[PDB]
Design a protein around this ligand. Structure first.
Ligand SMILES: [Cl-]
Ligand SMILES: [Cl-]
Ligand code: NA
Ligand code: NA
Length: 129
C-alpha cells in the first residue's frame, strides 16, 4: 500500500508512535517518506547482502528474517515479508524496538540526513489527528 501522508500519520499515531521514545509523529512520517515514499512494499538490497523492508526500511541483518541474510539476527522475531503488509503494525512494533536500542532514530539513515534537525511537524500539518 502507498499511504497518504495524513493517513500514515493517523495510523502511526494509533499505533503509539507519537512521541514514542520522545520522537514526535512528524519524525516518523518524515522517516517513512524518505525511506519508502510511504510504500509498504518497498524493498532495497544493501551492499552487505541484507535487505531493507517496508515503510520504515527495516534491515534483515538485525531485525527480521528473510532467509537469505546469513548470520543475521531476527531481533523483531518476524519474517521480513511481514513488514511489507498494508497493515503497518508489524513495522511499527519492530520500529519501536529499533528506536529503543540506544541510537534512537539515527538507525534510519534517511531520518538522520533528511529529517533530523528540520521542521518535522510540517509532515503532519493539516492532518486530522
Ligand atoms: Cl511532529
Ligand atoms: Cl533518542
Ligand atoms: Na537480504
Ligand atoms: Na518497515
Amino acid at each position: 500500500k502507498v499511504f497518504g501522508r495524513c493517513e500514515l500519520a493517523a495510523a502511526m499515531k494509533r499505533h503509539g508512535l507519537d512521541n514514542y521514545r520522545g520522537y514526535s509523529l512528524g519524525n516518523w512520517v518524515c522517516a517513512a517518506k524518505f525511506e519508502s515514499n510511504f510504500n509498504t512494499q518497498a524493498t532495497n538490497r544493501n551492499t552487505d547482502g541484507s535487505t531493507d523492508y517496508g515503510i520504515l526500511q527495516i534491515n534483515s541483518r538485525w531485525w527480521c528474517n528473510d532467509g537469505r541474510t546469513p548470520g543475521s539476527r531476527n531481533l523483531c522475531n518476524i519474517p521480513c515479508s511481514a513488514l511489507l503488509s498494508s497493515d503497518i503494525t508489524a513495522s511499527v512494533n519492530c520500529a519501536k524496538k529499533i528506536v529503543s536500542d540506544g541510537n534512537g532514530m539515527n538507525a534510519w539513515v534517511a531520518w538522520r540526513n533528511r529529517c533530523k534537525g528540520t521542521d518535522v511537524q510540517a509532515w503532519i500539518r493539516g492532518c486530522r489527528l
